[PDB]
Design a protein around this ligand. Sequence first.
Ligand SMILES: Cc1cc2nc3c(=O)[nH]c(=O)nc-3n(C[C@H](O)[C@H](O)[C@H](O)COP(=O)(O)O)c2cc1C
Ligand SMILES: C/C(O)=C(\C#N)C(=O)Nc1ccc(C(F)(F)F)cc1
Ligand SMILES: O=C(O)c1cc(=O)[nH]c(=O)[nH]1
Length: 364
Amino acid sequence: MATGDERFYAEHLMPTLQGLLDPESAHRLAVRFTSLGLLPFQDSDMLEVRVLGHKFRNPVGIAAGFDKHGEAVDGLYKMGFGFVEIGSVTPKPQEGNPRPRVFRLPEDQAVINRYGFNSHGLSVVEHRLRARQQKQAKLTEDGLPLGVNLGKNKTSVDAAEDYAEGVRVLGPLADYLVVNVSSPNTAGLRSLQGKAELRRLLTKVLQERDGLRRVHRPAVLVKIAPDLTSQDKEDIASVVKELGIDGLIVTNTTVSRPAGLQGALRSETGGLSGKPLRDLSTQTIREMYALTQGRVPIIGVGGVSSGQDALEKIRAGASLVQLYTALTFWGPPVVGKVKRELEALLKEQGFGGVTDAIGADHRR
Ligand SMILES: Cc1cc2nc3c(=O)[nH]c(=O)nc-3n(C[C@H](O)[C@H](O)[C@H](O)COP(=O)(O)O)c2cc1C
Ligand SMILES: C/C(O)=C(\C#N)C(=O)Nc1ccc(C(F)(F)F)cc1
Ligand SMILES: O=C(O)c1cc(=O)[nH]c(=O)[nH]1
């Protein structure tokens, strides 16, 4: 419990917790424990990455969705994440979908969720981040940056204005912002990934970002689905290059249900995460890196539970990776495990550090 032993968590604690609590209760309890700093690896220099205007002490971040309301940021750095992304946050508070809305597929090492952007809203999150703003400035300066992921309200009549409000309110408190246009759980949202709509939306977002004072001006990334057509991907690449978007987060959860899922809850509605998403996400990273000529930083996400999974996404083109669903199976020790395995594999494959491996599959 205090040592952070990989076998104890994986074989005993996590399976027992999963037997006692429904998945949303487990999520809530985990946010509480983490936020209080009740948790069970010294980052080598090889793991440092400079991208998005910042130093990252290691490339393993916590993906959006775990800490939707910015309650557990310090506890997540304490767990060993090199960067934390909170959100998605919507402009006004909203409850999200009815419960149950989160489902485990233990036989598949996967989760399906349909939270529907349950959010405390911008104002609450703004005050929560303001209460630790200078502590975060020091963390960022120390190589531990903070990302804020923005969503839109269910009943909003103007999606772009929702994201612009997010830029104005939380942009000043974030090292990077994410325009989340890839939740599967908000009606109409994924259609904003289409070319004309994306160009209009991101033009407005970047104008708002550019209007912030220079020390409060974050990088802006777009988080995309794993379910895009070839046409969709080509269009996103074109718009991102045309507008000078700072990066992409690849990928959100999938609405697909890969052949072979075994969990009893495989046909629940929602986005699927974890191991069945892993290679779909990796392949989306590979395609987006190629379409952007390796000039647009990618944060790779989807099914990472080991150093090999992280390195495959880095070699496919990610400069940084994130994970969430693996934590629900393996607990806290998985963060240090990914980092230690990633360092060992980089050495084994002749890389001087993470930076050298970024996009390495495209050069062979
Ligand atoms: C319970 C849950 C909630 C999520 N909520 C969000 C969210 O609010 N915003 C977002 O951009 N992604 C959200 N995601 C997606 C994750 O950030 C990540 O893209 C995806 O789960 C793939 O990573 P993983 O396989 O490591 O979980 C959520 C995922 C899960 C499992
Ligand atoms: C949806 C979801 O978050 C869960 C389920 N099911 C869950 O177990 N969460 C969860 C469980 C444990 C941790 C930690 F590692 F930090 F201790 C983090 C998140
Ligand atoms: O709140 C949610 O349902 C949610 C948002 C998102 O971006 N991705 C996801 O899998 N769930």
